[PDB]
Structure formats: structure tokens, C-alpha cells
Design an enzyme around this catalytic site. Structure first.
Site, PDB file in Angstrom:
ATOM      1  N   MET A  24       0.806  -1.212   0.000  1.00 38.99           N
ATOM      2  CA  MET A  24       0.000   0.000   0.000  1.00 38.99           C
ATOM      3  C   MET A  24       0.836   1.257   0.000  1.00 38.99           C
ATOM      4  SD  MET A  24      -3.078  -0.746   2.614  1.00 38.99           S
ATOM      5  CE  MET A  24      -1.926  -1.532   3.768  1.00 38.99           C
ATOM      6  N   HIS A 177       5.159  -5.488  -9.288  1.00 39.12           N
ATOM      7  CA  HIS A 177       3.828  -4.887  -9.393  1.00 39.12           C
ATOM      8  C   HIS A 177       3.376  -4.882 -10.849  1.00 39.12           C
ATOM      9  CE1 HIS A 177       0.286  -2.642  -8.895  1.00 39.12           C
ATOM     10  NE2 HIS A 177       0.690  -1.735  -8.021  1.00 39.12           N
ATOM     11  N   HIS A 180      -3.188  -3.100 -11.571  1.00 40.37           N
ATOM     12  CA  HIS A 180      -3.812  -1.790 -11.355  1.00 40.37           C
ATOM     13  C   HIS A 180      -3.500  -0.725 -12.401  1.00 40.37           C
ATOM     14  CE1 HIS A 180      -3.768  -3.163  -6.894  1.00 40.37           C
ATOM     15  NE2 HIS A 180      -4.850  -3.598  -7.513  1.00 40.37           N
ATOM     16  N   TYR A 182      -0.850   0.006 -14.079  1.00 45.31           N
ATOM     17  CA  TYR A 182       0.477   0.618 -14.113  1.00 45.31           C
ATOM     18  C   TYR A 182       1.279   0.064 -15.305  1.00 45.31           C
ATOM     19  CZ  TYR A 182      -0.890   2.674  -9.679  1.00 45.31           C
ATOM     20  OH  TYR A 182      -1.535   3.405  -8.706  1.00 45.31           O
ATOM     21  N   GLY A 309     -10.767  -6.853  -0.709  1.00 48.00           N
ATOM     22  CA  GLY A 309     -12.037  -6.918  -0.009  1.00 48.00           C
ATOM     23  C   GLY A 309     -12.204  -8.099   0.925  1.00 48.00           C
ATOM     24  N   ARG A 331      -6.602  -2.162   3.462  1.00 46.22           N
ATOM     25  CA  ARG A 331      -7.180  -1.095   4.273  1.00 46.22           C
ATOM     26  C   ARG A 331      -7.264  -1.422   5.767  1.00 46.22           C
ATOM     27  NH1 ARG A 331     -12.416  -0.794   0.864  1.00 46.22           N
ATOM     28  NH2 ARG A 331     -11.614  -2.884   0.369  1.00 46.22           N
ATOM     29  N   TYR A 358      -2.793   9.111   1.973  1.00 49.04           N
ATOM     30  CA  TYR A 358      -1.751   9.618   1.081  1.00 49.04           C
ATOM     31  C   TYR A 358      -1.191  10.971   1.518  1.00 49.04           C
ATOM     32  CZ  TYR A 358      -4.069   6.180  -1.951  1.00 49.04           C
ATOM     33  OH  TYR A 358      -4.630   5.035  -2.471  1.00 49.04           O
TER      34      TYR A 358
HETATM   35  C1  LIG Z   1      -3.955   3.668   0.176  1.00 51.87           C
HETATM   36  C2  LIG Z   1      -3.724   2.446  -0.659  1.00 51.87           C
HETATM   37  C3  LIG Z   1      -2.491   2.252  -1.257  1.00 51.87           C
HETATM   38  C4  LIG Z   1      -2.272   1.122  -2.029  1.00 51.87           C
HETATM   39  N1  LIG Z   1      -1.046   0.945  -2.628  1.00 51.87           N
HETATM   40  C5  LIG Z   1      -0.749  -0.171  -3.367  1.00 51.87           C
HETATM   41  C6  LIG Z   1       0.512  -0.348  -3.948  1.00 51.87           C
HETATM   42  O1  LIG Z   1       1.458   0.457  -3.790  1.00 51.87           O
HETATM   43  N2  LIG Z   1       0.722  -1.490  -4.690  1.00 51.87           N
HETATM   44  C7  LIG Z   1      -0.283  -2.418  -4.868  1.00 51.87           C
HETATM   45  O2  LIG Z   1      -0.087  -3.425  -5.543  1.00 51.87           O
HETATM   46  N3  LIG Z   1      -1.521  -2.225  -4.302  1.00 51.87           N
HETATM   47  C8  LIG Z   1      -1.759  -1.107  -3.548  1.00 51.87           C
HETATM   48  N4  LIG Z   1      -3.003  -0.948  -2.970  1.00 51.87           N
HETATM   49  C9  LIG Z   1      -4.035  -2.015  -3.189  1.00 51.87           C
HETATM   50  C10 LIG Z   1      -4.015  -2.912  -1.946  1.00 51.87           C
HETATM   51  O3  LIG Z   1      -2.846  -3.697  -1.910  1.00 51.87           O
HETATM   52  C11 LIG Z   1      -5.203  -3.866  -1.885  1.00 51.87           C
HETATM   53  O4  LIG Z   1      -5.156  -4.734  -2.999  1.00 51.87           O
HETATM   54  C12 LIG Z   1      -6.536  -3.133  -1.869  1.00 51.87           C
HETATM   55  O5  LIG Z   1      -6.590  -2.188  -0.810  1.00 51.87           O
HETATM   56  C13 LIG Z   1      -7.651  -4.153  -1.696  1.00 51.87           C
HETATM   57  O6  LIG Z   1      -7.396  -4.900  -0.526  1.00 51.87           O
HETATM   58  P1  LIG Z   1      -8.217  -4.528   0.797  1.00 51.87           P
HETATM   59  O7  LIG Z   1      -9.684  -4.752   0.505  1.00 51.87           O
HETATM   60  O8  LIG Z   1      -7.793  -5.509   1.861  1.00 51.87           O
HETATM   61  O9  LIG Z   1      -7.942  -3.083   1.154  1.00 51.87           O
HETATM   62  C14 LIG Z   1      -3.268   0.171  -2.198  1.00 51.87           C
HETATM   63  C15 LIG Z   1      -4.507   0.372  -1.603  1.00 51.87           C
HETATM   64  C16 LIG Z   1      -4.732   1.505  -0.836  1.00 51.87           C
HETATM   65  C17 LIG Z   1      -6.076   1.698  -0.206  1.00 51.87           C
END
Ligand SMILES: Cc1cc2nc3c(=O)[nH]c(=O)nc-3n(C[C@H](O)[C@H](O)[C@H](O)COP(=O)(O)O)c2cc1C
Length: 377
Positions: A24, A177, A180, A182, A309, A331, A358
Site C-alpha cells: 500500500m 507490481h 492496477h 500501471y 475486499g 485497508r 496519502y
Molecule cells: C492507500 C492504498 C495504497 C495502495 N497501494 C498499493 C501499492 O502500492 N501497490 C499495490 O499493488 N496495491 C496497492 N493498494 C491495493 C491494496 O494492496 C489492496 O489490494 C486493496 O486495498 C484491496 O485490498 P483490501 O480490501 O484488503 O484493502 C493500495 C490500496 C490503498 C487503499
């Protein structure tokens, strides 16, 4: 039978439970240097035998698409990471560095010399999406510049160097990575990749760049220290594929073939999925996505990490039913430094504040979420 709290052998690494810190972006690495804030953040979340994946970490100056995100392409950055890694290891954690290039998901203000961001394509992300700028305003994604073949190889080399630097910093491994929307996803997704050369057209050509990256970093630091993250069914920032099932299976087939050829398994495949609830957690009161995730896991030979999720209950079921070996949480880990303990106790989870995801303060909204009261023994 395995549960979410069972031990696991991730090839080279012994884990004591299956709860993973999802990568994250948090923007606390001021001027790209890992610092005392990052040390405490990862230390707080470390457990004995728990697996951690870092925030996306730049492999090059053109990698940047957020403010104050760390790099691992300079010695100064490596020295900062050493302190983070040492602290996590002192707690018994296993920690991988996520290697991140944003490609077209950037802005001139993030690029050296104000150059255009680089991509597979000259097509910008549409105005449906906006980018956080360093002055806490939101701006427009610009037209990117399409990479020439020789320049793609330069980026592969940047990944290779970053992987070597991660090992120098003491990381147990790295995660590519490839999700998403990128840079690598900009080549994989047929909604973005409109190239007519050897990096465009077929699934073979569209997967070429990410497979060259996997091959290069595996040669550099070993297959067993390399994980890969993809998101075929997430279409964030205009990153859609016409056939996510086939795209995911195409990547997986190539990973399987590479493992067979080289004679060993990658550390893992990490797939992040979309959700369809209002808050993005759990399931509504799509089975399509669930089926896709199980199909991909079934096809991939090796360790499978699911993310996106997942709740306590869905994480328990994913491991118990054999849908995944490891479950990553994003999260909830922001706001629950002791998330592993809370899940083991089925304790309430702290609410997370999106408004400080952020921002740049080393304490506020970063390291000041409380753990459960441990008391004084
Ligand atoms: C603030 C934030 C920053 C994130 N940064 C990254 C990141 O740098 N690289 C990545 O692969 N996913 C990133 N994610 C995606 C998370 O790894 C995760 O897949 C996403 O939050 C869904 O999982 P969750 O439901 O448990 O939050 C980020 C998500 C959030 C909310």
C-alpha cells in the site's frame, strides 16, 4: 487441514500464519528516502513468521506517480530500507519489496525534466480519472510517450538493478507490481496496448514485457525470492481487458512454463480482485469473479495469495476451502497495526481514515492507530 492461522512453507520461507500485509502506497517516504516513520510503520505490523509486502517502491526516476514514495535505485535509498528491514526481521517478519513503475499513470511534475510519462501507448488515461499532485490538488493525466523496444529493455534492466538493491538492503525478496493499470498492465491489457510490434497484438506479445521482467529478476536474485502481482479483472484508470479469464491464464501458463524450465517455483502469484459491495469489503447480500479466482489458482503451480475486499470470514474460508494459501489485507492493516492478533481473537477492527491514506505526516494517520491494550505483565 490448513486454516488462516496455520503455518506455511513459502518455498524458502517459513511462515507461522497466512495473514499478509498487502502492498500500500502511503507517501511518507519524504523525497523517496525510507525513514524512521516507515521503520515504525512496518515494525508495528510485524509478527513472528508473518509475511509483509511493502508499499510500491520506485525502480527509476520515471517510476514516480505519487508524492514521497520510496525508491530503491540509489545507495541512500538502500541505506534507508536497511533500517526498515532490520526492524521487521527483529520481530521475526518475512518482508518483500514491491517494485513499482507507474507508466502512464503519472504527470510531468513527477517526471525528470518534466518529461512525458512512458507507456506502451500514446493514449492517456481518460479525464474520468484524476491524479493526486504534490500540492494536494488533483490534476489531469497527460499523453504518455510509447516506449521503443530498446527502451523497454532499459526498464527491464531497472527492475533487475532494483531487485539486486533490495537484496542488498536485506529484503527476503521482491514483488513485481504488474497490476492496477500501471506500466506492465499497460502492456498486458488489450484496452490499452495498441502496439503493432513484438510487444503488441497476441497474448504472447502482450505478456512479453512482464515475463522478461520475471526472467531478469529471477536470474538476478533467484526464483524463490520473486513474487508477481496481477489484476486481470480490475480496470482501474482505463485498464480493461476484453477477456480477463484468458489474460490471467496466459500469464499463469507462462509462469508455469518458466518454473518448469528453470527447475524451481517462484515465491508466489498474487492476484487482487474487484468487489461489488458499497464499501468494497466482502460479498453482497459477483460469483463470476469468485469463479475466476479459483480457476486461476487451480491453474497456477505454486503459492497463491489473494487480495481485495477480504474480511475475517472470507479469509478464513479462502484458506480452509483451498482457494488460496495466503490472504493479504490492505485497508484493515492501515488502521490495525496488530491486525493478525485481532483476527486471531475476532476482535473489533479500527475504522480507517481514507483522508490520511496519502498525506505525508510521519505520525498522524500513519503510526498513531492503536493496537489492542496489551497491559503490563
Ligand atoms: C492507500 C492504498 C495504497 C495502495 N497501494 C498499493 C501499492 O502500492 N501497490 C499495490 O499493488 N496495491 C496497492 N493498494 C491495493 C491494496 O494492496 C489492496 O489490494 C486493496 O486495498 C484491496 O485490498 P483490501 O480490501 O484488503 O484493502 C493500495 C490500496 C490503498 C487503499
Amino acid at each position: 487441514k490448513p486454516t488462516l492461522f496455520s503455518a506455511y512453507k513459502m518455498g524458502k520461507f517459513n511462515l507461522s500464519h497466512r495473514v499478509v500485509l498487502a502492498p500500500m502506497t502511503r507517501c511518507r517516504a519524504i523525497n523517496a528516502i525510507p525513514n524512521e516513520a516507515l521503520v515504525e510503520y512496518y515494525r508495528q505490523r510485524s509478527t513472528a513468521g508473518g509475511f509483509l509486502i511493502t508499499e510500491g517502491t520506485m525502480i527509476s526516476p520515471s517510476s514516480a506517480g505519487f508524492p514521497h514514495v520510496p525508491g530503491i535505485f540509489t545507495k541512500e535509498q538502500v541505506e534507508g530500507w536497511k533500517k526498515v528491514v532490520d526492524a521487521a526481521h527483529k520481530e521475526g517478519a518475512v518482508i518483500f519489496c514491491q517494485l513499482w513503475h507507474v507508466g502512464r499513470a503519472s504527470h510531468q511534475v513527477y517526471q525528470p525534466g518534466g518529461a512525458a510519462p512512458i507507456s506502451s501507448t500514446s493514449k492517456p488515461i481518460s479525464k474520468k480519472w484524476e491524479i493526486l499532485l504534490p500540492d494536494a490538488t488533483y490534476g489531469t493525466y497527460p499523453e504518455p510517450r510509447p516506449l521503443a523496444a530498446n527502451e523497454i529493455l532499459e526498464v527491464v534492466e531497472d527492475y533487475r538493478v532494483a531487485a539486486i538493491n533490495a537484496i542488498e538492503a536485506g529484503f527476503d525478496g521482491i514483488e513485481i507490481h504488474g497490476a492496477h493499470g500501471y506500466l506492465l498492465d499497460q502492456f498486458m491489457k488489450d484496452g490499452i496496448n495498441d502496439r503493432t510490434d513484438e510487444y503488441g497484438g497476441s497474448l504472447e506479445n502482450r505478456c512479453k514485457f512482464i515475463l522478461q521482467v520475471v526472467q531478469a529478476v529471477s536470474a538476478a536474485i533467484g526464483t524463490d525470492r520473486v513474487g508477481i502481482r496481477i489484476s486481470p479483472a480490475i480496470d482501474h484508470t482505463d485498464a480493461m481487458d476484453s477477456d480477463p479469464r484468458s489474460l490471467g491464464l496466459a500469464v499463469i501458463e507462462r509462469l508455469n512454463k518458466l518454473q518448469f524450465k528453470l527447475g524451481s517455483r517462484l515465491a508466489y502469484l498474487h492476484v487482487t480482485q474487484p468487489r461489488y459491495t458499497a464499501d468494497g469489503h466482502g460479498q453482497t447480500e459477483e460469483e463470476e469473479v469468485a469463479q475466476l479466482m479459483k480457476t486461476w489458482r487451480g491453474a497456477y503451480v505454486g503459492t497463491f495469495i489473494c487480495c481485495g475486499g477480504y474480511t475475517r470470514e472470507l479469509g478464513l474460508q479462502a484458506v480452509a476451502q483451498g482457494d488460496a494459501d495466503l490472504v493479504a489485507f490492505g485497508r484493515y492493516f492501515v488502521s490495525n497495526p496488530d491486525l493478525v492478533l485481532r483476527l486471531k481473537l475476532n476482535a473489533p477492527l479500527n475504522r480507517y481514515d481514507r483522508a490520511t491514506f496519502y498525506t505525508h505526516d510521519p505520525v498522524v494517520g500513519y503510526t498513531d492507530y492503536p493496537s489492542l491494550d496489551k497491559g503490563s505483565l
